[PDB]
Amino acid sequence: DCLGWFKSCDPKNDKCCKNYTCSRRDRWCKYYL
């Protein structure tokens, strides 16, 4: 599964979908530019 945006994630255990990547600053699945 993946996350959307403001879902908590962990950069070492990224669960983000396409065009997203989880930040550590925000610790959420941040839109990856």
Those residues whose C-beta lies under 8 Å from the C-beta of residue 29, and which sit 6 or more positions away, are 2, 3, 4, 5, 6, 7, 9, 15, 16, 17, 20, 21, 22, 23
CA angle 9, 4, 21 (to 5 degrees): 55
Three-state SS string across 14-25, please?
Answer: CCECCCEEECCC
For residue 2, which amino acid is it? C
Q: What distance in Å separates the CA atoms of residue 1 and residue 33, rounded to the nearest whole number? A: 21
Contact 1, 27 (CB under 8 A): no
CA angle 15, 9, 12 (to 5 degrees): 75
Question: Number of folded domains in the chain?
Answer: 1
Q: What distance in Å separates the CA atoms of residue 18 and residue 33, rounded to the nearest whole number? A: 11
Q: What distance in Å separates the CA atoms of residue 9 and residue 13, rounded to the nearest whole number? A: 7
Q: Which domain holds residue 13?
A: 1-33
Q: Count the Cβ atoms, other than its own, within 10 Å of residue 31.
A: 12
Experimental method: NMR
